[model samples]
Target: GIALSRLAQERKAWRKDHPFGFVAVPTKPDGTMNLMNWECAIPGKKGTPWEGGLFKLRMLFKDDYPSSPPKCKFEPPLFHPNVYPSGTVCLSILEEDKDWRPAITIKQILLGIQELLNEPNIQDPAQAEAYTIYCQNRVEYEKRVRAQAKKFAPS
Candidate 1:
């Protein structure tokens, strides 16, 4: 297994070289940076309202990783039922209670995050109220989310 420090450095270099589905930044927790901050390039939207937008993301990981997948979240305000009001995401991969494969790497997780944006599993939502609106009025939801994505995406 790669040392965590070296793994982190390798990830940083990989990010610099690739447009990257997602990347992570470091944040100091307990004044020692026990946590990792994640970011990513938004998945390309070919024909949707979110087309041409390249958004950035952030996720905060927990100390008990691999054993439990990281606690993945997003930044700013996102308009999806799968995302909390605070922009934290709700996906099984990030869930500590489910089938989280520790073998997964940072790059894979970020790509999965991008995939989550495009397809939110309404069957399981972090916000029940938002899911109602998402299912009932998809156009409104798409418009709202598209506008939100554009706000954070690259020019």
Candidate 2:
């Protein structure tokens, strides 16, 4: 399948030219890799409230990947305006038939998620608790984000 082949190729390329502070690999119970599901770890961006945290995520791609974006979910869930309580991310580019592009790569998507941690989309709120705090009490929001950073710092 084109999707499988493409993922394999991307995986190969990533092995040599991997993005900094990011790691992604297929999550198959067996030794062999599966293109449909993957586990990723993205370190929070520098100079942001989320800095020092390493966010674990799961990426599930459909058979019709590229045409359909992968569903990205945070493992411990995230407290952000653009993220659901269940940890599902809400981003424009990840939407199907709206702004998804076949050319988008895993690195790009993960980088976008990293950026979203600091620069949340306030207008398009997903979780009420995070959004309300982000909007009304920025100082408290920073404190909570720091706590998460401490919790998920790479060991």
Candidate 3:
């Protein structure tokens, strides 16, 4: 009941005020949105090396969503300090019992992730290679991210 009502409310709000460079579509083939799954895409923020790219992600919600945070994972793995090897995102707002709040919405989560793309939380590194490169070499990091962006950019 909670997920259904909330998701429907979110779907309406999304259709009305969806932000730029991002898309969140329900995974159900019949186009009905109910529970537990979504397909999301976010374009690299402007001015960041991730610019011009569209990153795909899958969002898995629990039965008790809102009371708990959903799990968001990149489809092809993104090169980022806070993204895990399996592409799971490590974000404060998504941390259950920590920063996660019941009032948080799908719009907020996607926007937060978009912000994370350019401003990584280095203090909480997930994937070592990206974290190390992000801290140790700016040029190389930009190059790598750009290459990945170009490859994933929406056509």
Candidate 4:
């Protein structure tokens, strides 16, 4: 599991700096989940069909947290190499097989996840089919991504 040590403090700093930067938290479903959610909006087109809009991912940490990485997934279902149709993100950091140190804090975790927004590891993917299509035609891929993004726009 990725440790986000002092993520809240860092997020506050980031918010102070960018103002428009995104925030994530587990929230009461009824409340306006816009500002605080477990998901962060990803930027840019996925170079495939799933990057036209902001994506909110949900991180559900196991009670075993740290020793066991949090279970992360695209809340709105991001079609990425690691995110499955079930919204289960297959990021290696979240893998139990990987050597993860919980001594880490929230800020580090958030930054690492943020980096994934722009860069996705393609070599070991959870969804091979989509990755294949993405490698074939990026323009057409972006077209579909745009379509999916429009559906999640702030209406």
Q: Write down the worst ten-residue block by lDDT for model 3.
A: 27-36
Give the Å error, residue 8, model 4: 9.4
True lDDT of residue 25, candidate 1? 57
Predicted candidate 1 versus true structure: per-residue lDDT over 1-155, tens digit per residue: 23355447646666666443344655551766533555545655567665566665675555565466666655564667888877777777776667567666666676776677778897788776668878899888788777876777665
Instruction: Give candidate 1's error at residue 99 in angstroms.
Output: 2.5
lDDT for each residue of candidate 3 in 1-155, tens digit (9 for 90 to 100):
88777877877788888788789887765766546788999988888888899999998888787788999999988999999999999999998868998888889999999999999998899999999998999899999999999999777
Worst 10 residues of 4 by lDDT: 1-10
lDDT of 3: 0.89
Q: Each candidate's lDDT (Cα)?
A: 0.65, 0.87, 0.89, 0.57
Minimum summed lDDT over a 10-residue window in model 1 is located at 20-29
- TM per model? 0.75, 0.95, 0.94, 0.65
Of candidates 4 and 1, the better by lDDT: 1
Winning model by lDDT:
3
Which is the winner by TM-score between candidate 1 and candidate 4? 1
Query: Which of 2 and 4 is ahead in TM-score?
Result: 2
Order of candidate numbers by lDDT, starting with the best: 3, 2, 1, 4
Cα lDDT tens digits, model 2, 39-131, are: 999898888878888999999988787688999999989888899999999888799867789888888888888888899988799999999
For candidate 1, list the clashing residue pairs, or say none: 22-40, 23-39
